[PDB]
From Swiss-Prot, chain B:
It is a multi-pass membrane protein. This is V-type proton ATPase subunit c'. It comes from Saccharomyces cerevisiae (strain ATCC 204508 / S288c). One of its GO terms (biological process) is endosomal lumen acidification. GO terms for cellular component: cell periphery; fungal-type vacuole; fungal-type vacuole membrane; Golgi membrane; membrane; proton-transporting V-type ATPase complex; vacuolar proton-transporting V-type ATPase complex; vacuolar proton-transporting V-type ATPase, V0 domain. The chain crosses the membrane at residues 9-31, 54-74, 93-114, 127-152.
Swiss-Prot record, chain D:
The gene is VMA16. V-ATPase is a heteromultimeric enzyme composed of a peripheral catalytic V1 complex (components A to H) attached to an integral membrane V0 proton pore complex (components: a, c, c', c'', d, e, f and VOA1). The decameric c-ring forms the proton-conducting pore, and is composed of eight proteolipid subunits c, one subunit c' and one subunit c''. InterPro entries: ATPase_proteolipid_c-like_dom (IPR002379), ATPase_proteolipid_csu (IPR000245), F/V-ATP_Csub_sf (IPR035921). Its main location: membrane. Changing E95D: Partial inactivation. The chain crosses the membrane at residues 2-22, 49-69, 88-108, 132-152, 171-191. Belongs to the V-ATPase proteolipid subunit family. One of its GO terms (biological process) is vacuolar acidification. This is V-type proton ATPase subunit c''. Keywords: Hydrogen ion transport, Ion transport, Membrane, Transmembrane, Transmembrane helix, Transport, Vacuole. Gene3D superfamilies: lithium bound rotor ring of v- atpase (1.20.120.610). Residues 70-87, 153-170 are vacuolar.
From Swiss-Prot, chain F:
Belongs to the V-ATPase 116 kDa subunit family. Present with 55714 molecules/cell in log phase SD medium. It comes from Saccharomyces cerevisiae (strain ATCC 204508 / S288c) (Baker's yeast). The chain holds residues 199 to 248 of 840 of the full protein. This is V-type proton ATPase subunit a, vacuolar isoform. Disulfide bonds: none annotated.
Swiss-Prot record, chains G, H, I, K:
It holds the Pfam family ATP-synt_C. V-ATPase is a heteromultimeric enzyme composed of a peripheral catalytic V1 complex (components A to H) attached to an integral membrane V0 proton pore complex (components: a, c, c', c'', d, e, f and VOA1). The decameric c-ring forms the proton-conducting pore, and is composed of eight proteolipid subunits c, one subunit c' and one subunit c''. Gene3D superfamilies: lithium bound rotor ring of v- atpase (1.20.120.610). GO terms for cellular component: fungal-type vacuole membrane; Golgi membrane; membrane; proton-transporting V-type ATPase complex; vacuolar proton-transporting V-type ATPase complex; vacuolar proton-transporting V-type ATPase, V0 domain. The record marks E137 as: Essential for proton translocation. Proton-conducting pore forming subunit of the V0 complex of vacuolar(H+)-ATPase (V-ATPase), a multisubunit enzyme composed of a peripheral complex (V1) that hydrolyzes ATP and a membrane integral complex (V0) that translocates protons. V-ATPase is responsible for acidifying and maintaining the pH of intracellular compartments. GO terms for molecular function: proton transmembrane transporter activity; proton-transporting ATPase activity, rotational mechanism. Residues 32-53, 113-124 are cytoplasmic. Belongs to the V-ATPase proteolipid subunit family. The chain crosses the membrane at residues 9-31, 54-74, 91-112, 125-150. This is V-type proton ATPase subunit c. PANTHER family: V-TYPE PROTON ATPASE PROTEOLIPID SUBUNIT.
């Protein structure tokens, strides 16, 4: 009437909710690794022909 | 409890309705949305043709209507007060996954071809009867998912 | 699909569509057509989104030079505004658009060597968008291997100089014309490679078509130019023609053995997709017309980043119409006023 | 490898096949059972995250969608300031999708009560345990893809409103018909869980 | 949102009272409204010299809306007296309340009965227990549904104010009444259900209290099988109501383009409108749970801020503590006046703006028009 | 300016720089623009001309 | 239950008819997708070529009913008391015609795209166009005849 | 241990209060990230725009306050001898407010970023972007109020 | 069932038979894919080279029916009470001709377009082209000739 | 062991004390990394600013010592005979301040880089620039104040 | 039956006869794939040198038949009640010559096309080009020497 005690214990359902919580974690860390800083605004050149 | 009727049958039964619904709505979404990309693209050029341009999206939304009536039919056949077999429990997942991918594929095809169909429709008037013809062969792929599923639902009850 | 586009390029593609529908309509030029003088050309042009840019220009001193200059100027500040906000894929893409031009800058600069013309005004006559910060190239003693160290190592033109150094002492007008077409060839190989490996999906094929055309436009134009005044080898001709256009991977070799205009109509015969040189006084009219109807299709993709590359070439096409209008008015050339070309 | 991600999928796949096959040859098809797993586990944990995930990523759909159409709204707002208040209705069809996920959660919370030590694994509360789970991923993911769709169509509506403002009333038709499948995902949620009882 | 057209019902006279009062539900504290009114009262009395003075960038919207803040604080002060919330603390004013049992033990199940009902708003008895949060939000969501539906019908009842004035009795009376009995048919019954079950005593007269919203969905799903027994003649009127709403859905789209005949414009124009309007009622009536949720979030967020900041320093300490009270109050009042007032204020004022826009203007505004915009000669210099 | 001048002299250069405090406007940029004084050394006749 | 007939046996039957459609439907849709973009592109110039070019779309449709006619047939073979042997070979028949349909679906689509734009310049290409495309379509016939051969072996001599 | 109260019941509570902050704190960071880089980008030309364009990073900061106050409440509900019923509702509260917060955090980031660079060109729209961006808060607050409604069920019937 | 012929034995036979068709079809389809688009590209210049250039998709057809002949042959061998020894070695025959047929499918496809475009310029090429295709196709027949030996070992020995 | 306090309980406690410092140190590394390239790029043309605009780099260290002061404090709660309830809270305490800690590391990382370049062109930005990153730096202080509440509860309530 | 010869022993053998071919055939197909692009590219200019340039392609057939000669030889070792010891080495023989052909097939593929492109410009190259790919081919023969030697280890001293 019981599952196997080593890996198949009722703690398995305690393991899956940490896996789901890590799933939406590591997909979210992809976004914070993704972004760029758009350097073009930050420094401005001489550009003798325009001004 | 009977041997043929275990207690975890509501899992697979409710797996079916879930898979039948949202995968249908996924096909219905991108079927509509990718066409609207093409619709609003040439709206800037030609204001007039839009009254003929809503035919890809109304044929896209009917897949969700297929996905709904297959989901509303199989639900309501499930209650705690009666015990239903695992044999009937698996087939709702079968019925669920059948419609769900079928009109997803229908959604994909009329999504992309409905995009490009009204895209260069501004140039010629007469290709309309051609592009609406191939949408009918493209839409019935989701109709083929239902017509077996209704047969698959009436088994085992 | 088109879901992950608006993480970065959302605002930029949003604002460029704003710059799109401010271009001149087909009846717009007809309103400009009837203008008798330049203040008539000034005030009636202010009805569009351009206007108030001709404020503080002058009190009755206007040339086609001044009109072209500011109308170009309001583009380039604004292009540097939309290049200002970009992420890693978009920035180096839009930098490749900039890299596309600045090969014209070095070509024009070395052209000033044999004329011994003034250093101060050659960059004034040159194009401000294509720009690299280190410009000694005219003032130095111009020998290609001595010029090599300045242009290659610092500027991003480093990969584009391969097998390019022949008669490095001379720097003939024809030889500097050789090296730029070699540079264009080496550029378009790279730029096609970029949109192949790294660009989003709906912006691949519209870019590949539109850029491949520009390779083809480059190809047949230099084919005619080599035909008329030059005598070289077919292997020399085959180096100038980029294969990445791919509307004809086969007819480039068939162009190489064409030494006469009957040869080049025969060389472009078997393609049959597009017809230039078909009994037309203005050959470039066919190019610019075909270009705009490509760029017409380019704006019909909504989530493409390829809209801006169409847009730049679109807006520079109308400014030369404006230049054409202002030239015909002041110099009284009435019959060819209606040779302006715009789809929008 | 050439990619660390797709190799991991290939590596996690092959060990499942091998482990599952190893139990098969040694005679133990019983040591791996998906059926016993469903009965041993708590009926709360299915129903509970069903409440949590449904209202959870219905928000994500609304958030991701307004992320799309918000950027396109303010993009063409540089030329025409008239758009943002006139096309403000666009983000409402994106935002009301999250309300649908909310009213799922207030009607599911009434199902959520305590049970005795016995009758945990009776068929009645087991049904309603799995009900709130599958209704949860049903309506939530339905509200997710609705936000995808209505967002990018709402994006198109912004730049198409810059020219030909008479066209704008013709381009909202796909948007209202796009929001239908959001509501259709809603009504099937109450339909499937409505037959379910409370936790006794 | 847009300029009203010529000789049309203006939306200003609703918005004078509505926009602050709809805001007033959204937090509604006596404490926060007092601080809100005080800042606004300093603006109304300083007006004669400060309009001559140069304004900042954020000061522009504030000073031109000096009255829509000041009228707003009065209402929020009223709603605070209804909820009995002064910086997340109750009143203890009237002493009617509930009656507690006389003897118990510490940490025991302790219920209570009423000797009477509290005359104005809630009473103090629902302060402490976390189960009183359950009574609070169950109440406040029904507050949202009740007044907002009346507010929708109040906006929609002013549709006939302009149509009768346009002599449009030929057509739009066939437009109005199908729209009315669709909305007021379904959600009017759902509203009047809530009012009816509050009067009916389900304890003294032993009957099960039926489902709050469970009676809604089985009306559609089942053809008049209730099983909850709210009313004896409930069953007969339910199917009558369900049909007559459903019969108006063809009766709305058919009668207006019918002429004694369509261009193809108007038939499409109605069939987009009536399908929109069908989903509009179920969406925009349910869209008023903004009003409940923001009110629920606010008061509890102030509660824990009272708990975390004050009650640490509020515990007795002799020498450091009288300095700790000075310190943590400066950590208390700085957050709750700068962050919690302004951020939730600027949040909730844009919802009640939205709530007044996308729900009411759909009923008021049938179009747009031209502003009056006359030209004048004024001091205009900008370099 | 330095890295181009190192390549044109092939390593044997002598370079030093002296900074500028309170720098000066001009017509073209109309703006406070920092400067440095530079000194290079060479023996070649046309080299210095280069 | 019986050792020959366990209670989890029709799971392999229910997935067998399920997988028969989903790879066929994704097969047929991808085929008419890439063929569909080809037809509309080549007809924007030289119009009125329609009914000659729909044969890649029509043959994309024919593989779809190949997927349906087998799946509805194995649904008539499903049963609660059925053997665990019968559940396998209908899944074997399910995966056969399904993946071969998706295989041919790739084949129809890419030949359809590059094909029909070629017919605009060369009107003589069309005689080869059906001849190139049926050798993609007979692959879809092959998955059917092996699956219907298996479904005949379903009930035969089964305890 | 016991059938009503096993010993792995506090796991879902400790991870529930953990997830409640860190998912919103990621969103509040990314909300601060793209809006902050936009402010630093656009006001280098225009000084006076600094104080009124700061409102996305102010509104992004509220999302951490939302994730904090729910994480504080479940912390007072923890105990060693704890029901499995009250265990999951703490995790059910935790991820609900959590991933709603980052999703709201993602929205405030981009719409703040596109807002402040748009506000330099058109001075009319900074009223209009605040109108959009307040919707990007409160859907994260929807994840809060569902967590409050689940937290109400905690201490009542613990058994 | 029994230890020598358990009930999971036809699982390896059913998907073993399924593996025969679906890999050789996907091989044939991929072979027809890149070679067929080579046909449509090269025939717009001149029609007459079509019938000389149809030989790869014929060879793609032959490697498909190689997978058919074995799967038709294995279908008569299946049963409920067969050995597990004969269950596995037919899966060996299923994979062998399947993936080898897939291998030539990679071969004939990428050889075909490079062949057919070069055959436009050089009429001397095609005689050498089919001599390339034989060593691609005899590679595919190697899978059948090994799989045909396994099925003779199936029915030979049993309990 | 007992049912309440097993032998595998300090495994969740030990890696929680590790997770407290590691993810904050990664945040402090990333925060110092992109602000470091932010400093060293823009101040070589304008040297005098380096004492002034270094405040992204030092506030990157501030979230690091947040991760330390929890980790040294949860170290005093470890023991062999401890409850699994104590082991779970230390897991929650580490991941709270840890993963929020790197979020502050990512946040003030790019803001420090983007801030210091814009402050070089316009000196009016720096007075406003630090005001942005404070709202990102208090995110790490929130991660501390949650873990501080869990650690106060860990030893007190345990019956065993 | 016994622990020395269980019933799941022929699974390791049946996968050996397959993997002997399918890794070898996929490897050898890649050689004729990339060399086929090489031959078709150069012979449109220089037709005459085609006949001396199939020596990459025919040698890929030689490594292909290496997979057959082991697989038909290891096929004769199978049986109903074989030992599990002799089951293991049949894949061990198979996997060795399997992947080594995939190794050597990559070798003569990549050196093949770049070799024959050089033989177009340099007529004296190919006498030197073929002798190094022999040293790529002897890599493929090494997997055959070890697999034949393990197959001798199979049926002797089994019990």
């Amino acid at each position: 009437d019981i599952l196997s005690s080593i890996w198949t214990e009722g703690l398995l359902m305690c393991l899956i909710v940490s896996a789901l919580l890590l799933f939406i974690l590591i997909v979210a860390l992809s976004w914070i690794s993704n972004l760029d800083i758009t350097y073009g605004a930050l420094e401005k050149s001489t550009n003798p022909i325009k001004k | 409890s009977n041997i043929y009727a275990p207690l975890y049958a509501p899992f697979f039964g409710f797996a079916g309705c879930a898979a039948a619904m949202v995968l249908s709505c996924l096909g219905a979404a991108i079927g509509t949305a990718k066409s609207g990309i093409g619709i609003a693209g040439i709206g800037t050029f030609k204001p007039e043709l839009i009254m003929k341009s809503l035919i890809p999206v109304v044929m896209s939304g009917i897949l969700a209507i297929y996905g709904l009536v297959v989901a509303v039919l199989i639900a309501g056949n499930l209650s705690p007060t009666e015990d239903y077999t695992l044999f009937n429990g698996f087939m709702h997942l079968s019925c669920g996954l059948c419609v769900g991918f079928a009109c997803l594929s229908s959604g994909y095809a009329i999504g992309m071809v409905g995009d490009v169909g009204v895209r260069k429709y501004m140039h010629q008037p007469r290709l309309f009867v051609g592009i609406v013809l191939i949408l009918i062969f493209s839409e019935v792929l989701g109709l083929y998912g239902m017509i077996v599923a209704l047969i698959l639902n009436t088994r085992g009850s | 699909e088109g879901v992950y586009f608006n993480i970065d390029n959302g605002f930029i593609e949003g604002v460029v569509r704003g710059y799109r529908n401010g271009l001149l309509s087909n009846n717009q030029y007809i309103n400009l057509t009837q203008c008798d003088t330049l203040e008539d050309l000034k005030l009636q042009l202010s009805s569009t989104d351009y206007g108030n840019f001709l404020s503080s220009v002058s009190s009755e001193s206007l040339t086609t030079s001044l009109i072209q200059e500011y109308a170009s100027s309001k583009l380039y500040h604004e292009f540097n505004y939309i290049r200002d906000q970009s992420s890693g894929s978009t920035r180096k893409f839009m930098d490749y658009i900039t890299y596309g031009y600045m090969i014209d800058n070095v070509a024009l600069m070395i052209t000033g060597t044999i004329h011994d013309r003034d250093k101060g005004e050659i960059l004034q006559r040159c194009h401000p968008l294509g720009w690299f910060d280190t410009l000694p190239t005219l003032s130095v003693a111009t020998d290609l291997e001595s010029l090599y160290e300045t242009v290659l190592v610092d500027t991003p033109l480093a990969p584009y100089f391969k097998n390019c150094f022949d008669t490095a002492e001379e720097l003939d007008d024809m030889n500097i014309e050789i090296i730029r077409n070699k540079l264009y060839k080496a550029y378009l190989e790279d730029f096609y490679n970029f949109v192949t490996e790294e660009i989003p999906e709906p912006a691949k094929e519209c870019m590949q078509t539109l850029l491949g055309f520009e390779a083809d436009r480059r190809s047949i134009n230099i084919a005619l130019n080599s035909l008329q005044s030059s005598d070289i080898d077919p292997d020399l001709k085959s180096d100038l023609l980029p294969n990445i256009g791919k509307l004809y991977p086969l007819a480039t070799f068939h162009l190489a053995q064409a030494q006469d205009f009957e040869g080049v109509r025969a060389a472009l015969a078997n393609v049959y997709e597009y017809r230039g040189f078909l009994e037309t006084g203005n050959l470039e009219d066919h190019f610019y017309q075909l270009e705009m109807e490509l760029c017409r299709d380019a704006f019909t993709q909504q989530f493409a980043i390829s809209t801006v590359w169409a847009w730049m070439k679109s807006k520079e096409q109308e400014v030369r119409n404006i230049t054409w209008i202002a030239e015909c008015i002041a110099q009284n050339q009435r019959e060819r006023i209606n040779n302006y070309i715009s789809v929008y | 490898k050439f990619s660390f991600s797709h190799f991991l999928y290939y590596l996690v796949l092959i060990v499942v096949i091998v482990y599952g096959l190893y139990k098969l040859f040694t005679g133990h098809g019983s040591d791996i059972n998906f059926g016993k797993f469903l009965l041993r586990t708590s009926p709360y944990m299915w129903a509970n995250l069903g409440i949590a995930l449904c209202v959870g990523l219905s928000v994500v759909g609304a958030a991701w969608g307004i992320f799309i159409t918000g950027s396109s709204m303010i993009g063409a707002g540089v030329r025409a300031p008239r758009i943002t208040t006139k096309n403000l209705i666009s983000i409402i069809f994106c935002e009301v999708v999250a309300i649908y996920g909310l009213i799922i959660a207030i009607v599911f919370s009434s199902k959520l009560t305590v049970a005795t030590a016995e009758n945990m694994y009776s068929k009645s509360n087991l049904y309603t345990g799995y009900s709130l789970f599958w209704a949860g991923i049903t309506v939530g993911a339905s509200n997710l893809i609705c936000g995808i769709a209505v967002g990018i169509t709402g994006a198109t509506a912004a730049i198409s409103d810059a020219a030909d403002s008479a066209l704008f009333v013709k381009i909202l038709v796909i948007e209202i018909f796009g929001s239908i499948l959001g509501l259709l995902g809603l009504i099937v949620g109450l339909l499937m869980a409505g037959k379910a009882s409370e936790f006794q | 949102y847009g300029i009203a057209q010529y000789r049309e019902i203006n939306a200003g006279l609703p918005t004078i009272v509505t926009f602050p009062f709809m805001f007033a539900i959204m937090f509604g504290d006596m404490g926060h409204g007092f601080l809100m009114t005080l800042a606004a009262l300093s603006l109304v009395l300083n007006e004669k010299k400060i309009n001559k003075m140069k304004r900042g960038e954020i000061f522009d919207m504030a000073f031109t809306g000096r009255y829509i803040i000041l009228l707003m604080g009065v209402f929020s002060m009223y709603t605070g007296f209804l909820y009995n919330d002064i910086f997340s603390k109750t009143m203890t004013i009237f002493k009617s309340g509930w009656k507690w049992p006389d003897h118990w033990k510490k940490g025991e199940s302790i219920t209570a009965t009423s000797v009477g009902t509290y005359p104005i708003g809630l009473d103090w008895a629902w302060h402490g227990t976390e189960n009183a949060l359950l009574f609070s939000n169950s109440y406040k969501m029904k507050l949202s549904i009740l007044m907002g539906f009346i507010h929708m019908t109040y906006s929609y009842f002013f549709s006939l104010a302009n149509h009768l004035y346009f002599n449009s009795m030929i057509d739009i009376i066939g437009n109005f009444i199908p729209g009315l009995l669709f909305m007021q048919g379904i959600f009017g019954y759902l509203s009047v259900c809530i009012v009816y079950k509050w009067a009916v005593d389900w304890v003294k007269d032993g009957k099960p209290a039926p489902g709050l919203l469970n009676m809604l969905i089985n009306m559609f799903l089942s053809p008049g099988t209730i099983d909850d027994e709210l009313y004896p003649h409930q069953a007969k009127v339910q199917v009558f109501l369900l049909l007559m709403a459903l019969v108006c859905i063809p009766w709305l789209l058919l009668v207006k383009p019918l002429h004694f005949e369509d261009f193809g414009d108007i038939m499409i124009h109605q069939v987009i409108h009536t399908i929109e309007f069908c989903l509009n009622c179920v969406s925009h009536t349910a869209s008023y749970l903004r009003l409940w949720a923001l009110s629920l979030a606010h008061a509890q967020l102030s509660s824990v801020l009272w708990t975390m900041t004050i009650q640490i320093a509020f515990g007795f300490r002799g020498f450091v503590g009288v300095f700790m009270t000075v310190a943590l109050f400066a950590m208390w009042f700085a957050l709750t006046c700068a962050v919690l007032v302004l951020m939730e204020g600027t949040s909730a004022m844009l919802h009640s703006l939205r709530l007044h826009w996308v729900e009411s203007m759909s009923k008021f505004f049938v179009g747009e028009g031209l502003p009056y915009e006359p030209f004048a000669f004024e001091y205009k210099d900008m370099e | 300016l330095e890295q181009i001048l190192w390549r044109v002299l092939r390593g044997n250069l002598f370079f030093k720089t002296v900074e500028i405090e309170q720098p000066v406007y001009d017509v073209k940029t109309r703006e406070y623009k920092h400067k440095n004084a530079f000194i290079v050394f060479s023996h070649g006749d046309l080299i210095i001309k280069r | 239950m019986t050792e020959l007939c366990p209670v989890y046996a029709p799971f392999f039957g229910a997935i067998g008819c399920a997988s028969a459609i989903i790879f066929t439907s994704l097969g047929a849709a991808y085929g008419t997708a890439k063929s569909g973009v080809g037809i509309c592109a080549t007809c924007v110039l030289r119009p009125d070529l329609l009914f000659k070019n729909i044969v890649p779309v029509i043959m994309a449709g024919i593989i779809a009913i190949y997927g349906l006619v087998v799946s509805v047939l194995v649904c008539y073979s499903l049963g609660q008391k059925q053997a665990l042997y019968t559940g396998f070979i209908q899944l074997g028949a399910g995966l056969s015609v399904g993946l071969s349909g998706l295989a041919a679906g790739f084949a129809i689509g890419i030949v359809g795209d590059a094909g029909v734009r070629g017919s605009s310049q060369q009107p003589r290409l069309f005689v080869g166009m059906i001849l190139i495309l049926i050798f993609a379509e007979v692959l879809g016939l092959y998955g059917l005849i092996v699956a219907l051969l298996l479904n005949s072996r379903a009930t035969q001599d089964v305890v």
